[PDB]
């Protein structure tokens, strides 16, 4: 019944991190937030230049090797263990592998009560926000806007194309069982 | 005729910096961007704890003393001199003093060809974005959403309540004379 | 035998994060880094204004309430679970409670093979670096420089007062069993 | 007599920005700080991918084109105009062209009272700090450690190899005429 973990999936610039910060403010109990950004931040800088690490193409493409996966996997078991220990966890990720990525997460969460959230946004709109964010490599938002949702099953879906982050946070918070 | 400087005015979280980065991307010639954020960044950290410096109240209020003004004034003459020297300058500021703030800027720009831009956004919407930005002191967006525009005259007005940053950038870019 | 986790303890501005980034570069296998900075970053922003959250005094003091501890505890079990799952973890923390803080960590790591590292630095020198870092609240470095080491037991001790981060990283890396 | 502007020159990771923040804290009057970092930040992001913009090689090399120079030049006249208007300015730059770079600055400052500061640091030590800073492209520090000082004339020279930033700030502050 009680929601232990909230997992958001959406393309780059779809507005996930904004929604996450809104949720942390809205939800009464303290929720810990981790995601693709914090993981990469925690990983050695050289992982971004490594063999089977992660590589960001100049056109917005992304390649993930086994070195990166091995770590991410251990990290996933860790966040789940945190939830199991009583910490409310919010995870924002990018399911590059679509359904396969969701399945990978399912293998780690087991029977933990999870709230699966989909964060959609028009490709062209996301691209604009990517440019607005100033520093982002161009091309990622457009490339990930749709494929990351293929075959993915959600409990709640929000679309930031015409809805503010705080509004999507309200919609999501309503599906969180205390 | 040729636009030398673009000055944007709007409350906190109205979306100015996003628009500025979009303009830098859109406009063909290179535009240098400076604003309230970069100025404070350039000022001594102690200016934020000083006598007649700048003080951010816990409720989102802002107080500016003479020490801060003295510097800002010299800085303003500097950015104008940059434009005079041929650098295309974009300035994003918050006219806390309404018309008075615009008048102060006018005293510095002289007959320089300037494009005055107003960036409006619904107070409640701006507040939401403030929360989404995660780290912002709560209360500033609501407090500045309307008063900073009182008596201010613009050449172009954009409203980010229902328009993306890139879209507002297109509207503004159309009024920029090459 | 094989080192699974490296735990660094030292006062603010002692140079922990610099050493951690050097270790991630030096050590051949990928090491995940988490610490006080990333935890606070992951915690709701409101935790910094909460009842039994964390509070940074204007003079550099720090108060931790039960709300903060509850989360930190679950988080600690999580990073340990990550190590247990095969991820090499580096943790940089500030043992405000001295030996008590180390004991708390011991209760979580169990028999996991851990490398306890002490990072010392002259109080006045740390204070200077605090000022140099530009944005840091003044007073923290001096306050934490010595008490955080009282009764704490280390496997390796490095002193950054006259040694570069990369040098301390070499000293620490030599005690890491592959 | 009265010092109007302080210009620091040194290779990447030599510790310039740390010294600058120490100076802003130490010096009694408020000093505005601008440098290579703030300029690039103010320039369009695309300047880093442009024809005659700025390009950072993967090995730490740096190439500056005419597009970048044109802007920098106008910007230089601007900071000088700020000083002329009464704002105390601190500039931290990297004289890639050695004496030629200092000459370029001289053409802009005219007879303005300037304090020329040299910030040296052992190449290998700077490289280590580069790694410690975590995110810096490797190779820049070593490449710039010595050539940027060739034929450059200073009023004060500080060496951060064995001196803290705050200490170098004290040495520099002593040559600042009120
Ligand atoms: N609902 C929204 N309406 C308009 N702009 C938004 C909205 N949500 C977020 N933004 C803006 O979009 C930009 C990018 O969004 P954000 O960083 O939240 O995306 P993200 O999905 O977290 O990105 P990534 O997947 O790369 O980590 C930011 O500048 C953010 O402020
Ligand atoms: N048109 C928009 N639609 C939705 N979200 C937007 C829009 N423009 C900007 N945002 C988001 O609003 C937040 C705050 O906006 P931004 O930082 O651009 O405001 P600002 O006016 O520059 O703030 P300040 O005055 O404090 O410097 C950011 O998270 C940004 O991504
Ligand atoms: N060995 C060193 N010699 C000189 N300066 C150093 C050294 N190690 C780190 N520094 C500098 O000291 C400053 C503060 O150090 P750092 O941020 O690494 O400390 P920290 O212990 O991680 O801080 P906190 O506990 O607040 O997280 C930084 O500006 C850093 O570059
Ligand atoms: N005197 C010092 N002793 C030890 N570490 C130092 C000293 N001064 C600075 N550092 C550290 O060296 C690193 C790099 O220095 P810093 O960023 O100040 O260099 P910089 O010359 O400003 O770089 P750039 O030219 O790329 O802008 C930082 O992590 C900083 O904390
Ligand atoms: Mg995100
Ligand atoms: Mg702004
Ligand atoms: Mg640290
Ligand atoms: Mg610098």
Rounded CA separation B89/B77 (Å): 12
Residue B58 CA: distances (Å) to CA of B63, B138, C44, C58: 12, 8, 18, 13
What residue ranges do the domains of chain B occupy?
1-178
Q: Looking at B37, B57, B59, B113, which residue is catalytic?
A: B37
Pair A146, A132: CB distance under 8 Å: no
Looking at the CA of residue C165, tell me the nearest atom of ligand 3: 1
Pair A153, A98: CB distance under 8 Å: no
**Which ligand is closest to the CA of A90, given by its number?**
5
Rounded CA separation D124/C69 (Å): 42
Rounded CA separation B26/B166 (Å): 9
CATH 3.40.50.300 fits A1-178, yes or no: yes
B10 is in an annotated binding site: yes
Supply the DSSP symbol for B177: -
Rounded CA separation B70/B61 (Å): 21
Provide φ and ψ at D62, rounded to 5°: -140, 130
Looking at the CA of residue D15, tell me the nearest atom of ligand 4: 18
A18 touches chain B (CB under 8 A): yes
Helices (H) and strands (E) in chain D, counts: 7, 7
How far away, in angstroms, is B132 Cα from ligand 1 center? 9
Cβ contact A131–B164 (<8 Å): no
- CA quadruple C165, C169, C170, C172: dihedral sign: positive
Q: Which residue has the tokens 């806007």?
A: A145
User: A62: which strand partners?
Assistant: A56
User: Exposure pattern of A79-115 as b/e (b: 16+ CB <10 Å)?
Assistant: bbbbbbbebbbbbbbbbbbbeebbeebeebbeeeebb
A73 touches chain C (CB under 8 A): yes
Q: Which residue has the tokens 């700030």?
A: D169
Which residues numbered 118-177 in D keep a CB inside 8 Å of some CB on B? none
Residue B171 CA: distances (Å) to CA of B22, B29, B168, C68, C117: 11, 17, 5, 47, 57
User: A54: which strand partners?
Assistant: A64
Mutate to test the interface with B, among C45, C134, C137, C139 (most CBs of B within 10 A): C45
Rounded CA separation B111/C75 (Å): 60
Of B84, D54, C4, residue with least CA distance to B76: B84
Cβ contact C18–D167 (<8 Å): no
Rounded CA separation A27/B128 (Å): 15
Structure tokens that stand for D162 in this block: 């064995």
Pocket residues for ligand 4 (CB within 6 Å)?
Answer: D 10, 12-18, 36-37, 94, 129, 132-133, 160, 163-165
How far away, in angstroms, is C8 Cα from ligand 8 center? 28
Residue count of chain D: 178
CA D17 to chain centre: 8
User: A116: which strand partners?
Assistant: A7
Beta-carbon contacts of residue B14 (< 8 Å; ≥ 6 apart): B119, B120, B121, B126, B141, B144, B145, B160
C13 lines ligand 3 (CB under 6 A): yes
SS3 at position C10:
coil
How was this structure obtained?
A: X-ray
């Amino acid at each position: 019944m009680t929601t232990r973990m909230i997992i958001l999936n959406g393309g780059s610039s779809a507005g996930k991190s904004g929604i996450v910060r809104c949720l942390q403010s809205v939800l009464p109990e303290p929720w810990l937030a981790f995601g693709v950004d914090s993981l990469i931040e925690a990983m050695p800088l050289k992982m971004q230049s490594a063999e089977g690490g992660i590589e960001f193409d100049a056109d917005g493409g992304v390649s993930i090797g086994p070195e990166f996966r091995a770590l991410e996997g251990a990290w996933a078991e860790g966040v789940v263990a945190m939830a199991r220990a009583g910490a409310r966890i919010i995870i924002d990720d990018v399911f590059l592998g679509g359904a396969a990525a969701q399945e990978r997460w399912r293998s780690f969460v087991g029977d933990l009560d999870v709230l699966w959230v989909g964060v959609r946004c028009d490709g062209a709109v996301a691209e604009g926000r990517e440019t607005a964010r100033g520093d982002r490599v161009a091309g990622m938002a457009a490339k990930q806007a749709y494929v990351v949702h293929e075959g993915v099953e959600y409990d709640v879906e929000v679309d930031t194309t015409h809805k503010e982050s705080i509004e999507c946070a309200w919609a999501i918070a309503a599906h969180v069982v205390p």
